[model samples]
Target chain A: RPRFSFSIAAREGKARTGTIEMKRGVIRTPAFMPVGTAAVKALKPETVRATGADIILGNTYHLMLRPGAERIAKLGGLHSFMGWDRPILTDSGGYQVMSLSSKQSEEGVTFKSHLDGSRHMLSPERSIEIQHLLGSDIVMAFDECTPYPATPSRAASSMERSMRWAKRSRDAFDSRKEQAENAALFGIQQGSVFENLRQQSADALAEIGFDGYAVGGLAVGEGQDEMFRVLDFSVPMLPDDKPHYLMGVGKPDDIVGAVERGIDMFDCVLPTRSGRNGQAFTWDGPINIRNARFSEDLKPLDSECHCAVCQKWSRACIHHLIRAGEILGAMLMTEHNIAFYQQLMQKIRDSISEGRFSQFAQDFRARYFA
Target chain B: RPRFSFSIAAREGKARTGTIEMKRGVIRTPAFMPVGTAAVKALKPETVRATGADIILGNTYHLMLRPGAERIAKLGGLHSFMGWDRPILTDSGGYQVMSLSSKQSEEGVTFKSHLDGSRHMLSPERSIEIQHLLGSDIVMAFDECTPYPATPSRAASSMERSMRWAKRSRDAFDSRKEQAENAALFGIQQGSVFENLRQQSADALAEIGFDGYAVGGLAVGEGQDEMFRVLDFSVPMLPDDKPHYLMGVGKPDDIVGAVERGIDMFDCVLPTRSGRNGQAFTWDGPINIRNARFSEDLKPLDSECHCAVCQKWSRACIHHLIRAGEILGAMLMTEHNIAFYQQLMQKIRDSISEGRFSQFAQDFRARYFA
Candidate 1:
């Protein structure tokens, strides 16, 4: 088994491009992982790869509840189970607390399964165990996802507790020994919007040590300006050599801004989710395909895209499918959106490598927000 | 333009194997045309083609109401609009009447749009005109779809009116001389369950002349016994040189029996529709993936199948996906079912060519219905 290794290949100001070598494959940064919460929402494993994505993020909470971690291990693990055959990043059963109705405690988070009203628990040790059973390439540290709009005291307590869990998460991951040899565990920094709390969380996590660091909790609901503000102050606190991940983010603009702030990875559900609802993202931003205006439009979904959907289908055709509630409409729409996100990441990497990321960012936002 | 041409290459009793050469491509005998009533339910056109189908069936009424024939024409044709370049067989708006709440008259049928409840009409001339506008390779002659269990007098009147409409459909198609050069028009025989009425309907259509003839109105809830019985007496009524199409049929058994009685072409919605509902077809009939017995079943969907889905995914995975209501489950199940149907057709052709169709048919049914 080959363990994970990271190296920065090029830098343009705060933005940089690099590669993360893992047992399965190399993931290029700044890589954007599409959410496959329970199966890439609506895409096949091959279709996701066709979008140029080297990796995907799976939901630990969802899998642990429905299929059971033991069941997946018995069948061969998440990659073989889903037919992805590539690196997978699994969150450590913490975000489900924020995503679903749940209660937090000193030990861990407990919640009722949205699937069948079954109660379940998630402690740091159990979270690490589940990630291992799922054969996760990038395992996330279990942390309290400090809610947005928390008071300073709440943020501080949340940050301090998450740092403590990070230590337990690291210990549990290391205890796995042989299994953890080829996988990477990332500690999450959760301090809401306070500068002091963010630094404290980062310092405690880095001291405990892990393969990478994540700038979490900021994208909860805070505006992009606030997110960038926190990143500006909190980014340099983590180890410079490790990859920096920004979780559950964002729109196209948020990604550009974060990459400029030294973020190397991102995972979000907007591309597939909104796409299934007939919304498509492009260089010119998002457009709803069900609009009557598109019923007779002769143009492609996005003239700039070279994806299979855009290369063959017209806006009028997609509009018809969407209006008729055809499944092909969702499939084609999501296919394009996933391709667009991957294309955006590719462009970000190329611009950074060519030392033109600053100009590319300005030009992209100008047209996207035009 | 390659006007439609068909030749029987081999024969075993009434069962035979051959090829139909049209402008778009060569369609082997016993070809199963998957129904794409707008789209192929949950399948992409490329996926449908990958199942080895040389052609597909489109519904004139569905396309006319949603995208409109004129809209597709402006974009090129149904072949271009739907992203399928192969030969396409389109209904002549007659079946839509049987499918929806409608009233028939001397001139045509009138119905409320099942889509928007808007009133619409379908005359013989209008049906042929729509098929031409859709650039259909095999255009059906518009005829009244006689209801099952109808009175003998009712069947007689309906069949007589359809014979009159067949003449009008032919005239309309012939008027479009440029399109008619490359396309084939198939006249339908509708006589409920009466043999004399069927012979009369066939004789009238043959006298009027058509590129092909369809045995219609039998698969509309007439059960296999009645349908096969009707085929026994009515198949030899038409010209031996032309192709024989059996519309809106059927289960795998229905297809096999029809082929054993000289039928050459078929179209059905079962494979795609049932697949979306978690039912998969195999040599041993259908299995519902959502059943609890499949929760830990490590076997593939079908042991003897060689589809992309069966090749990579376990029955347990498909079971989990269907239980979780994942769209990929619908996609994979449909993919396998379509492949299975095409494989059945290939076996049917091969068996006939080898002079052993009779034995193969018996063996297939023994396992399929065991």
Candidate 2:
């Protein structure tokens, strides 16, 4: 069987429910992969998997600079090292390198490690090589995650560079014949909001081709409307045969809009990050556990949330932890956020499959506010 | 049944094993209660109980200043207020009052609230009254935690004043008919590390005849050796029928030593506090999760332990959270420490039951490295 195979089961307008079968697991679309920047230490992978997440996303940038991909490979890959024997998708590290880098260059970006001041470089080929060494099942092709607020000219040049690098990333991925055989590479589409550039980027990627196409360069603080506008018309221009991934486009509402606009795969750190900071996505909108209003609230973060955090804790309790800056706050919040995101994905898929996505979307937007 | 009862099962040297059966819960002795200054939001009472913690300790200073015990009582008591339906042992807040007071006077210590700067008097009677309102299972008598580095005269005077307060605390506790019917009062022994003063404090408390006797005024950075010295001779001076509590007496080794010295009850913030700072307590030693050595070390914090933290997470993973300054690190560490303390308590109990405490102590000292 193929490492991954996607089949669209049903659709409501542009929204579609599908299944993504991977060697280790199956991701039901529209799927949401929780961002575990570093392996979650407090939560076991099994506990994380219990949240119904078939796949977990790891950041290549952090992993490569710290443990180094070669070391990870020698240690038996990211999965074996982390003890997560499931579908693992790793980014090319180019996105974080370009965005979080101290300085930008014509060739690529160079950055000091966030952990230490150790310098490192991230270009398309290097990123792909690192991902391969990490033994990721779904290896994202390296590309400039096109910096936001970019001038159209700058965006085009960056997108062109990324497109060229995307080819190089593909070549580097293919060069390692064994790694290429085991993992599938997904090309990231990178044009700032410019439609002409987006079209050109998509066309270039289609020509070079990939196992999948990802809409990158959005949700870098790009508002949902701008992101949706790009997705609205840009998605149909890509090949319908491959799965479309919206990288880092987020919040539950943002995800719903993207799924409605034909996105099949999505990954973001919003849920986990927010959870870490005490913001939880609940049925009644997002509740910030750090808020003073929750100091004595006996109600759970979300009455509808069945996650361990919500099931056992009260808002008052979470508020106390968050206010006191307790670690349990992060643990509870992360668990809740992961569960919330996974549940949202499940709901989206169910809605799409049942041909009631519009109704589901409307209801969700109306109620998902504190 | 009594709201709280201490039954001695065995006496080994000055140490004894007992049970504290309360209306809400039963606490097995030679037990250490984790201090939750503010409500522990991440830890539900049932969850704490499941960890083998029969009771939890709360600070009167924090509670009185924050939600107020009266408010808690009006809202159906601390059990409901904190969502803890187990035995709660609340300190008199005398330690904080003594430590935090801005002005020390002949009449009493005058302190401004750090929160609101509201002037509030916390004499022995008021402290006992607050505990009564909170419906505490075990109420500690209000006594000034004599500051460190005091002259012998000052220390004696402080201990004498505290002994007087102990009588008042006893009188106040005894005056409350409903509270007296349900709750038990424990007298605090304060002497600032002087054995003579400790004996005087203990003798006075034994004469007053309380349900339990707590060795206070130590773990004030007086150093463990000095604390053990005081506990060594002082513990034997206390009543043998009742439990002996060593208040704020700390670290894993401190606990072991105190337990060996005949202490049956203890409360400390070491495990919980260090946990927040990413220091993990294990049988071997306390491990700093923020250390660079753990960045890639995938081994569990303790290979021998069976706690959720050890069973599921790696040192590297916790290090990631700690480095990221994520709360999950604290949460995981706190969980592990609590589990560690409970396990130690169990081991102590087992050793005592088998008359192998000397062997356990030797093995523990050899293996433990802080």
Candidate 3:
């Protein structure tokens, strides 16, 4: 009978550490969620959990189209289907519809399935319904992911419509009375680069209320300075009692920067996706494993880490695997990167709790970006 | 230092259970060696070990071609290079030279690399040196894999040449004074379907005196009936005190049948390779995950399996992964099939030890093949 409840554990400057208690499990923040997308690349759900992640992200668009939501429901929900028992945060399918679909309309977006090009529509109501069927732990409100480089008027109109859709999503989520007490929904804020529009979007969502709030329009190809500038104004506008999630974010430094500005949750494909392409993120920034320099390197991907890849495998081995196009290469690299991200989050949390987050951020950026 | 030794503990009919003690570890037979050709398909060597595999087979051809013997030696040995500390049995490159190469001669077989089509040669001396450089625990003598449907004269000539090469391989291996005491050499028997040719090959190899003997050339293109027919005549010719390996002999029933004929060791790419293609080996038999019939089947791959994949994942999940072309599909299914093979081997060993191998074989074949 437990509902979603988040409480601040510690604070340093604008950064704070907290925990989100849900029906499935408790997720600590500023948590960095590794993207499972479809299958977490070459890793199992248990492997992701072993990397110190409390939750993982799944794509509503990918699941709904391929196996179909109804099939997953009958077989069991996404948790059992994907074999992850921890909390899962699913996107509303709006972003994927915008990126992958062929048509757009007021009623919703029409998507030609990325897998097979079968047509499907995802309105606010339908998005919530799919998430419901998926048995999502943290359901996101469906909203238009406004493109970067938009005019103020264009951004304003998109943000307003997203706000309207957010209300519809909330209504649909609430209508699922049978299981309402188990899950919590998060509303998305979309205002492109304008501070006032972001504030207006935030206020609109605040009026409707949600268990959590997310900054949605940033990290869409905007550079770090612009993204941070937008976060500076946009993030504090959301209710402080609710958890703050920053969606589709970013590089290691981006997560650090956003956390310093009061963001508490993140989901991105960088770690797992880059791993598949032979890119590894270490404490000293990201290194491309495909580089010829790594072909005979006897060192681990990151010497200071404690993950199995670092503990047991050498860079030369992984380099050979990647060069050979072995799937274990992707599996190992992804595991290492996810472990690094989780370790980074843990460090951030520890620093915040110790009241030295500023120094931690400055020190990390200096070493990683050097 | 303990040298290679094999001792039979029990026997039922023609089938026997035994143990092979080598420098690296103890292998319980009838043992199944998962093929780690180039890279073990979708699994890490450690995962293969976790599936109850006592040892894994590495291809001298693939290793020499891709990472190269000198490179693996430079990095450490094949065990350190591939992150597998357990015993590794490396086949001589002769089979690959016959199948993948573009030319042949008495001095050596010239072939293009299967990966990049670069020219390479695999003479008996070079094959032995490569296996030495790879630090293989069980080194196989270079022998031509005779083609099926070969005429008596053709099979005789191939078998005679292989016997000559086997002597050269043994001589080269014995000359490695530093490793002579630690590593064991296995000689391969090659003849088409001719019993007299097989007998001659076996006698010639026995004269050379290997630590182990392998029955090869039977599984090349020969059907189960033909392969079993060859085994019936050929297996008893090898020294019972040494190990008997059946190269590339497969399928659950095929393994069951071979073990019943006194084969102690086996290697094949079926479990790993077929898994990548959506084929799963279960107690009932092999089932293709690509089939629509599995899209909603909520059962584990094999109800009797104790692997984490079977204990947790459903056929529907594997079906979804396969349909989406996800790497986890290959990883999971490969793990399951490999686990099933190891489990089969364990049952075979247990049956022999318990004096019921005949009953076990009959029951297994009825359930698996019927």
Kindly report which residue pairs in candidate 2 clash with one another: A285-A368, A285-A369, A327-B327, A327-B331, B15-B262
Error of 1 at A270 (Å): 0.9
Model 2 C-alpha lDDT per residue in residues A72-128, reported as the tens digit of each score: 786668887666888888988877766564566656667888667788887777788
List where candidate 3 sits over 4 angstroms from the true fold: none
- Per-residue C-alpha lDDT of model 1 across residues B57-76, encoded as one tens digit per residue: 99898888878898888878
lDDT of 3 by residue, A1-370 (tens): 2678999999887788999998789899999888866688899887889999999998998889878888888888989888888899999988877777665667788777776777888999999999989898989999887888899988998999999999999999999984477889999998899988989999999999999999998877889999999999988999998899999895899999999999999989989889989999988989999898988899999989989899988888889889888888888999999999999999999999999999999999999989
- For residues B219-328, write the lDDT of model 2, one tens digit per residue: 87778888888888888888877888888876778888888898998888888888878888777888888888887787888888778778777787677666666555
Clashing pairs in 3: B101-B111
lDDT (Cα, 0-100) at B133 in candidate 3 = 93
TM-score of chain A of each: 0.98, 0.95, 0.98
List candidate 1 stretches off by more than 4 Å: none
Worst 10 residues of 3 chain B by lDDT: B99-108
Q: What is the DockQ of each candidate?
A: 0.73, 0.27, 0.82
- Each candidate's B-chain TM-score, in sequence, is 0.98, 0.95, 0.98
